[PDB]
Symmetry: D2
Subunit: 292 residues, 4 copies
Amino acid sequence: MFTGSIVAIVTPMDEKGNVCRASLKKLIDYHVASGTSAIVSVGTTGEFATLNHDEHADVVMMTLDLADGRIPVIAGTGANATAEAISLTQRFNDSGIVGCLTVTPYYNRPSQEGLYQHFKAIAEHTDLPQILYNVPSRTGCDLLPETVGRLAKVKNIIGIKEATGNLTRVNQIKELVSDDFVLLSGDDASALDFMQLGGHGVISVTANVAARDMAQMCKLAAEGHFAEARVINQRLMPLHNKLFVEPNPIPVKWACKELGLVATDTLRLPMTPITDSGRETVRAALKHAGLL
Amino acid sequence: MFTGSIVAIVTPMDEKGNVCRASLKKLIDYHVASGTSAIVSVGTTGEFATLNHDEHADVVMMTLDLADGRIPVIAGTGANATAEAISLTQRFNDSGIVGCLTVTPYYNRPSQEGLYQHFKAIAEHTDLPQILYNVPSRTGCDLLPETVGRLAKVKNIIGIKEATGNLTRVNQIKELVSDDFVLLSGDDASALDFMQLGGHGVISVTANVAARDMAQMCKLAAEGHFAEARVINQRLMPLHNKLFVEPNPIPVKWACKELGLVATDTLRLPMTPITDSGRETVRAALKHAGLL
Amino acid sequence: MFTGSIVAIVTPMDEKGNVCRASLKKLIDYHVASGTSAIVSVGTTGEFATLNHDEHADVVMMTLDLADGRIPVIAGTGANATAEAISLTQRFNDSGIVGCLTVTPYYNRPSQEGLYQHFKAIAEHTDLPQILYNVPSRTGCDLLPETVGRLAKVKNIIGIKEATGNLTRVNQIKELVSDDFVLLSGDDASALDFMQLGGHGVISVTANVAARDMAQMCKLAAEGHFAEARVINQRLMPLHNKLFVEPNPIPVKWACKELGLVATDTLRLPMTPITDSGRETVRAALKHAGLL
Amino acid sequence: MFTGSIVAIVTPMDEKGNVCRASLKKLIDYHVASGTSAIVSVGTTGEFATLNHDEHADVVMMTLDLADGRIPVIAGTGANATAEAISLTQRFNDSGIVGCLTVTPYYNRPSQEGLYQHFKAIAEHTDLPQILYNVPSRTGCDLLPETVGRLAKVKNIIGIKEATGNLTRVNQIKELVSDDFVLLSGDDASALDFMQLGGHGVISVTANVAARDMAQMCKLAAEGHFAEARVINQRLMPLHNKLFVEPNPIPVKWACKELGLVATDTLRLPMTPITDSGRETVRAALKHAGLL
Ligand SMILES: [K+]
Ligand SMILES: [K+]
Ligand SMILES: [K+]
Ligand SMILES: [K+]
Ligand SMILES: [K+]
Ligand SMILES: [K+]
């Protein structure tokens, strides 16, 4: 459901830029075989910015179909207009997804009162569980712990993906919310630290290409075996870093292609193909993790 | 017209959040009478974030119809997907707009090369003049002078709205582009300084309520009369700051309502109504500028 | 020695700005009675910036004398010139202090190679244990984990006071150093989190006025009792924050006076007396902690 | 003289780190011949951080003796303890210096009120003109325009060396001070922009090796001939940047050695010798400026 290693899955494309079903099926089978806890479909790593809402919905529904009940699917449903976020969420009502990952409005820089009204309105128009998502480097907006506390009082707001990389947020949030509100890292390089402080898992880029290792790390964390988890983390740290050598998901798509998990590493503009220097860097990180 | 005081006009709304034609007419007449150089329709201040593409186009067309040839209109046309920006651009071909204001992709944080490809593609598919728009605090990415220099070689990329507030950008860009490339400030509080360093004008929030003083300030600046311009700037500085006391365009829409230029101060979520403390701050700034 | 709750003790002054022996003795007796693990004398909170090296040495020696073997004393010995740091350290050779707290050079912004040469030269001119101290908001310099690793190879460099508040540093450093290199927080508000990640204690401002609570928190942490430690932390969090409402040690000196621990709250310029608003804020925090 | 191109002169050292009188003479003659306005002796670039007060005074006196009335000398006199700044100031009373350059307290992060008291006290105890010096990247504190305005009312506080590189400060300060208060840039790369906005000159690192071009650039700027000045600035921009490729004054001392102006490029720890890559970068910048 909402703990352990959750992959922010790539939306694999053909050379034309449209979803590649055979690739998507190969990835999903991989995540089932690897012990991934859930799949986030059409999150940031899934190129939500460059799919239209129809295309987005098609990918989510295809992912659900291919998952075939073997692995839970959380849909990306964020938007920077509240009405649009409500419309997008309503597309998934009764779909089979287990909840929604909803990013703070980007670009328009709402106030904290605005963020409260936005997420409350979205939560009120669905029965689906809502995971807030804070990623200020992308959005220009920072959903602060006090406001997460206020929102956690809404019945179906049940967790947060905290992608600041600021580990002080874990216990600031935890003290204002109930014991069952889920804290998930959105920052691979700090995620083991985030779990060590009390978080419950990660929505991960790295899990796209090191799914088994990520699942093993997160299990060890949950069991309180941090030193064993950290050995895995150290083997993965160059991926955690170098999968952002160029803008995500440029590196992870390349890595997926290199590993034979997807047919092509195509992305949509303004994301551009990986540079030669980038390929060499990512290749080295994959080798360090023992994947190549 | 791409120099002088250009207003980033509000999109006035009724209580339902729908565009108020009567209020828009009043603003347009105000700008014609007050000597504003041009109107930026559905820029940031015009709530491009929360209008859909149809409503956005309607507002641009309504603005053109109401302007009736008396003042030039520039349309906001940016998007974070290069295909969507191209699509939106096509809607305005032969509309009567003089140019497009096209923001760097927000949220997805493309590389410089990605920005280059993005804007180059948009420019290729129109004959309309394009004004690049850099606002890193909103978008998460920063279109750097070197890339602006590469883009300025494209025939119909004709200027930039630089909203960093980092004044060193003026001459870094100027030295890389031709003498006819327009530099426009997107930061009211530093705009006179921007013009003093070589900028050609401003795309302004303050101009929505102080159009005549903005128009004269920019003229004096273009003539080299900076001391004279600075007297006006000092009277407007509280507005340049306090129009951002809560997220733009919340304060300026309230100010327009207080002056009687628009029927209601309604905005779309996630923007919310001005706080009482914000009304007090904004009113004080209006009085400092001599407007109430 | 170098774990648990270490107080960065204030240098109490008379009204003239010189050390007050009776106050210093009262504080030291308090730390012995409270279970404080060690005292840092003439660190940042002890006003190292505004004591001359003679005055500094006198305070350290007086603190040692008053401690009377009951509680270990670590001297502040940092300087931004290597020669000066060596001279200051040599004053304490054979003094009775148990080690030195040596801040990265401030103002001059050395490179990482510079930081390496600086601390290596200092370590080579003493037999005393050296605790590095990184506080970039004050110094303009950031001693990065790689360089801490390089330095940890020097026999008598035995730990670090990490005052960035960036909790990712704990495990970055730990993986590059031996199991016996000591990690101490220099940031009260994050210090329980820092210990939860693997750190060994804190050099604390808050311990000046909540010494018993800080010692109890740190003991619980070391025992792996984080939830119990966090209850104490929550009671102390307003002090952890509000003891920096005005520049440290302005608030903590006031609080020490209010509690009857020191005779006067005098400081040296450019530190100035606490403002009325500050007194009210600090008073509230003391009340929250159950100290007043 | 407190306008035009003022050099923040290196303190040339022999291999032992002691001041080289022969090298200093050569530099002083160079500045007299090249039209430099004044010499700042034992500023940041002069390694004020690593000279003791006696050595600092010796260098100022030697500079005065060598200048022999041919060029005005301003002494660096700042400290982070108000008493120490006063003490140092007294050493220079009736020395022959024309003024003092006094940096905001570093490391201890005083309040604005603390800065006000600090500088007010220093000014009270001398008849020498005082130039305030703001460099937040080094000091950890930021002397804001409002406080500069309060200090400019003190009769002998006569200007400011503003080294933020934040160009909005020019007119924020100008509007709060009298027409005769001097604004000087402390950031070579933005200094021409600073002058274009109303600044009166620069306290420069670049001037150590490009004194004549700096002197002419500043004259053209003072005359309003900004286009002409900017041609010179463009030839000097690689030096303005690459003199900071490693910590200042490491690169400029190497540059002075390469040109033959000083016998050795030796500095005091924690400054270290220039890297090979830095020598290559600096040399390239020298050639761009036409100096080798
Ligand atoms: K809930
Ligand atoms: K939108
Ligand atoms: K062009
Ligand atoms: K060691
Ligand atoms: K020093
Ligand atoms: K004055």
